[PDB]
């Protein structure tokens, strides 16, 4: 009933019957009773693969009901909601027919064509792994070749249609997500078999006009021979099918009813079966294919005609074009009869380059058989070369981006010309500008975001699911990057609204780039353009430093972030040696001198921009492949310009044959250490000297790690390579001093309000604090944390006094101590990450051999955690500091490189907890639990000590349990453990400390 009646409604859809009273009655009946039930049962509609047959027709009729006319907007909404909810809970397997029927209406981009794109984008957003990953997505499986071809064609259809159509805000806004979803779903390296672009065109296949032109008959000896040979080979097919040739008409004989031997074969069928051969040959000669007879000679066919042998690619392509002619002629003659109804279309009425091979097989076999018949006899016919790399989706997409990029550079040059001279509003290419701005940039952004891994992978190193990208793709990507860099170089001021999109796209394209293979044997044009990119960037940085003493907005908005990310990517992928060399080396060195020359400047602009320059020069030091400092041994380094160039080539490059002379502003690395140590000893504040802290500390923290492994401290794996003295002679003592200096600075500057760069200095020192000497604990960890705990206890005492007093003055003081707790939170969050690194690095050694300093630090952090747990002010100010400065991000970074409040427990009672847990004997756990019970009764520290003294005999016995047996065995087997810990005083101290730690930790978990 349901499906037959909705068949009936879809049939009555016709405009002649659309206005029928009971037709509207059927429409109301469906949209009010049947369709809502289908939407409700849609979650259960899942699976049904077995019954997919009806499901298919049911999908078709729901789509046709949505396509019906004489329907209210509410009814249309009901049908569209049914379609959406249905397709949400349907396996992508049976959706191929729906998508194929939709291909007719997807690229029309009419008013009614919006809902199809919404359904398509929802479907491809749901099924992402089904298409990109060759691995089957769940039990749904993997995409078919026809499905991938269809989504490719749909993507290109929307691209071209929306490019040619005039800008519409609604259409662009709603259709761009669909294109993004298709781009994400389609694998970058898809290679469709029929990559040739017909570039034509409902579906009306135009045949080839060949009857008007006169058909040459100089090869009739071949034309008639092949015309009869087709029927003879048909008889050969019959005998291979194991059926004899029949003489008279008979329905039981599927073989030709009058198939008779040539002695008794009537010519009436022979003179009528030749017409298809005539048509094929006439069309073949109608196209630009001249045929010459190279040779001169001449009931079952003795010579066999087959099609399983190989043949020349271009000649087979011509045969493929002739098979396309076969199919389109068949389609024309079928649609001549089919067009009488005006509704629906034949399932195979698709372009030849679009149809799959299984339905292509008949025409392909016919063309190949005719071609073999030509080939063996020796008929020479004469009048593209597309490789698989070109057939890749990424190649065509990148070519389209380059094309629209040159168009974009043209119309933005026109825009600059017209804005410079007056103001011209109606630009001749306004549609192009709006397309490129609104949809093109998000498209490339999303596509490169979802396929960053594919382009970045190399043939040797398969990085990601995709194998690799071709070197030619890897160079056109770099060409595109440098070209958009050239555009933003000047035209940053223009399209300021879209400038954030431009800089985001620049950031994305800075990644997924193998600059190593760009430079090595890369295209000269691309290499020269990118080298000129660094040269222009360096000269721009020089312009800004001279101005500090349009470029200003260009640098700050785009160049510094994007190119800073550039050095970050270079350092991450070890591109420094390959990218930074020769003129690139000179440019970045000039940038270094310019960025360091701003130390004398102390104006508001340089003060506010100094952190950005600090990040930039930290990235310079990270990605910079020569020891700019300690330059006496720069000759040994191969990457140095002096080593790469002969003395004459250095002279022509501008090298004065003295490495120290280009940048005497930056002293030697050793000097740096001396200056930073002296400033730390004198306690220079952030305001007293901003330049050193903001600039030279990034130099140290990025210089020392990168060149430490290749330095003397870490022996090189290749002794012959390391035989020359290292260009950098830093040892472990260098880093240690650096860390100590940094810490000395941190402990000296702690009362400075609004010391915001403390956290960024902690971030930069977070990598360098590791690989640290063990003595650094007793050097600069217990004293600093003890001073911090004194300060915290003082503020907690003020809070306790201010809460025990009750007045408006008490509330105002509570606000004041809330501010004090906030600055305490700032200082403690600044100090903790380095502590985390240190305790993680030294935890195993401390567990293996006990350390009294480590135990004291455990007590210290435990007391701090007690203060934080008891003080609600501390918790609320920690919340405020976290939300204000986004220190939750920094806390998560520290956590993953080892909650918002977890910074107070990982540094006190989670990482270092075993240190304090191991002091107590395994047989003192009874005292520990009893002390915890005292805390549950809320007994003070002295009082719980009293009960430990009274109930010292409540301790466990080694004989009591086998668990205690082996636990006590291990405890006495620990090498550093001694019998002096048996003192009751030590026992009660450790039991009280551990019990308070556990009690307050569980109170923090649950009040």
């Amino acid at each position: 009933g349901f499906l037959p009646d909705m068949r009936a409604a879809a049939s009555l859809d016709t405009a002649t019957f659309s206005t029928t009273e009971m037709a509207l009655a059927l429409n109301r009946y469906l949209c009010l009773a049947v369709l809502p039930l289908i939407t409700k049962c849609a979650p259960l509609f899942a699976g049904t693969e077995h019954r997919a047959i009806m499901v298919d027709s049911m999908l078709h009729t729901v789509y046709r009901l949505s396509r019906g006319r004489s329907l209210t907007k509410a009814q249309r909404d009901v049908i569209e909601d049914c379609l959406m909810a249905l397709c949400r809970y349907i396996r992508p397997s049976m959706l191929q027919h729906l998508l194929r029927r939709l291909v007719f209406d997807v690229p029309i981009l009419n008013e009614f064509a919006k809902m199809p794109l919404k359904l398509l984008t929802n479907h491809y957003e749901r099924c992402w792994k089904y298409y990109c990953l060759p691995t089957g997505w769940a039990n749904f499986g993997v995409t078919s070749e026809e499905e991938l071809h269809l989504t490719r064609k749909l993507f290109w259809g929307i691209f071209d249609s929306l490019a040619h159509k005039k800008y519409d805000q609604e259409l662009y806004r709603m259709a761009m997500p669909c294109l993004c979803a298709i781009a994400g779903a389609l694998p970058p390296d898809y290679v469709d078999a029929s990559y040739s672009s017909k570039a034509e065109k409902n579906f009306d296949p135009r045949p080839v006009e060949t009857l008007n032109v006169i058909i040459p008959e100089k090869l009739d000896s071949f034309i008639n021979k092949f015309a009869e040979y087709t029927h003879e080979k048909w008889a050969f097919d019959k005998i291979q099918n194991n059926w004899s040739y029949g003489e008279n008409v008979d329905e039981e004989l599927k073989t030709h009813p009058m198939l008779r031997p040539y002695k008794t074969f009537s010519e009436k069928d022979k003179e009528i079966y030749r017409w298809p051969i005539k048509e094929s040959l006439k069309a073949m000669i109608a196209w630009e294919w001249t045929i010459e007879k190279a040779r001169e000679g001449e009931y079952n066919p003795q010579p066999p005609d087959l099609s399983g042998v190989t043949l020349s690619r271009e000649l087979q392509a011509m045969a493929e074009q002739l098979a396309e002619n076969y199919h389109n002629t068949w389609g024309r003659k079928k649609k001549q009869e089919l067009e009488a109804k005006g509704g629906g279309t034949h399932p195979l009425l698709v372009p030849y380059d679009t149809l799959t091979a299984k339905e292509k097989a008949r025409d392909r076999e016919k063309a190949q058989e005719l071609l073999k018949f030509l080939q063996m006899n020796g008929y020479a016919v004469t009048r593209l070369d597309t490789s698989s790399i070109e057939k890749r989706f990424a190649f065509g997409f990148l070519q389209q981006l380059l094309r629209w990029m040159d168009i974009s550079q043209e119309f933005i040059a026109h825009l600059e010309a017209v804005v410079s001279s007056g103001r011209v509003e109606k630009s001749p290419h306004e549609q192009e500008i709006k397309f490129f701005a609104k949809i093109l940039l998000p498209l490339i952004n999303q596509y490169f975001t979802n396929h960053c891994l594919y382009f970045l992978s190399t043939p040797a190193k398969v990085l990601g699911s995709g194998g690799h990208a071709s070197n030619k793709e890897k160079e056109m990507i770099t060409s595109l990057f440098c070209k958009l860099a050239a555009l933003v170089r000047h035209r940053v001021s223009l399209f300021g609204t879209d400038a954030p999109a431009v800089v985001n796209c620049l950031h994305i394209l800075a990644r997924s780039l193998d600059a190593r293979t760009v430079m090595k044997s890369g295209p000269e044009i691309v290499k020269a353009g990118l080298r000129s990119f660094f040269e222009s960037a360096s000269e721009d940085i020089e312009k800004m430093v001279e101005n500090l003493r349009q470029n200003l907005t260009y640098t700050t908005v785009a160049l510094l972030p994007v190119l800073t990310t550039l050095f970050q990517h270079i350092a991450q992928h070890q591109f420094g040696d390959d990218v930074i060399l020769d003129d690139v080396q000179v440019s970045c060195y000039r940038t270094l001198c310019s960025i360091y020359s701003l130390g004398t400047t102390k104006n508001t602009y340089v003060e506010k921009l100094r952190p950005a320059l600090g990040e930039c020069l930290a990235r310079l030091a990270a990605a910079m492949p020569v020891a700019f400092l300690e330059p006496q041994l720069n000759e040994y380094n191969a990457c140095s310009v002096y080593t790469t160039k002969s003395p004459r080539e250095r002279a022509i490059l501008g090298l004065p044959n003295s490495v120290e002379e280009m940048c005497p502003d930056i002293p030697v690395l050793d000097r740096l250490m001396a200056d930073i140590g002296g400033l730390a000893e004198s306690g220079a504040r952030y305001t007293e000297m901003p330049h050193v802290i903001e600039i030279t500390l990034p130099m140290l923290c990025s210089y020392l790690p990168r060149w430490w492994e290749r330095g003397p401290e870490a022996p090189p794996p290749a002794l012959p390579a390391g035989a020359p003295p290292p260009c950098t002679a830093v040892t472990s003592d260098h880093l240690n001093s650096l860390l100590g200096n940094i810490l000395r600075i941190i402990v000296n500057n702690l009362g400075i309000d609004e010391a915001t760069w403390m956290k960024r200095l902690a971030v930069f020192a977070q990598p360098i604090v590791s690989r640290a000497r063990p003595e650094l604990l007793h050097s600069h960890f217990i004293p600093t944390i003890g001073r911090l705990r004194k300060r915290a206890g003082k503020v907690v005492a003020e809070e306790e006094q201010l809460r025990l007093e009750a007045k408006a003055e008490a509330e105002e003081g509570e606000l004041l101590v809330r501010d004090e707790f906030s600055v305490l939170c700032r200082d403690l969050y600044a100090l903790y990450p380095l502590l985390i690194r240190y305790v993680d690095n030294n935890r195993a050694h401390w567990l293996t051999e006990p350390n009294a300093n480590a135990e004291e630090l455990f007590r210290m952090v435990g007391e701090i955690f007690i203060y934080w747990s008891k003080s609600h002010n501390f918790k609320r100010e920690e919340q405020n500091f976290v939300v204000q400065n986004e220190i939750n991000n920094m806390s998560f970074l520290t956590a993953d490189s080892k909650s918002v409040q977890t910074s107070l427990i990982v540094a006190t009672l989670k990482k270092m907890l075993p240190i304090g847990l191991n002091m107590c004997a395994p047989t003192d756990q009874d005292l520990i639990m009893l002390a915890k019970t005292r805390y549950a009764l809320k007994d003070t520290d002295e009082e719980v000590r009293e009960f430990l003294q009274n109930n010292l005999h409540l301790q466990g016995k080694v004989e009591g349990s086998p668990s205690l047996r082996w636990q006590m065995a291990l405890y006495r087997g620990l090498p550093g453990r001694e019998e002096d810990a048996d003192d009751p005083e030590k026992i009660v101290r450790r039991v009280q400390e551990v019990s308070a730690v556990l009690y307050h930790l569980e109170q923090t978990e649950h009040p």
């Binding site: 195993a844 567990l847 293996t848 998560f892 956590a895 993953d896 082996w966 065995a969 291990l970």
Partner: protein, 48 residues
């Protein structure tokens, strides 16, 4: 990838659990269930 310390979680107890190890061709490995803490290494780091 998300940073969770535990490889798995919320695992139902059910029938129980047993130690298990599987080795490919040409691969050798030592299994120490923990019969003696003296031979058990890295126990005091995390397990103990």
């Amino acid at each position: 990838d998300s940073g969770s310390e535990t490889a798995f979680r919320e695992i139902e107890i059910g029938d129980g659990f047993l130690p298990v190890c599987s080795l490919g061709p040409g691969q050798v490995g030592h299994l120490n269930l923990g019969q003696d803490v003296s031979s058990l290494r890295f126990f005091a780091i995390c397990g103990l």
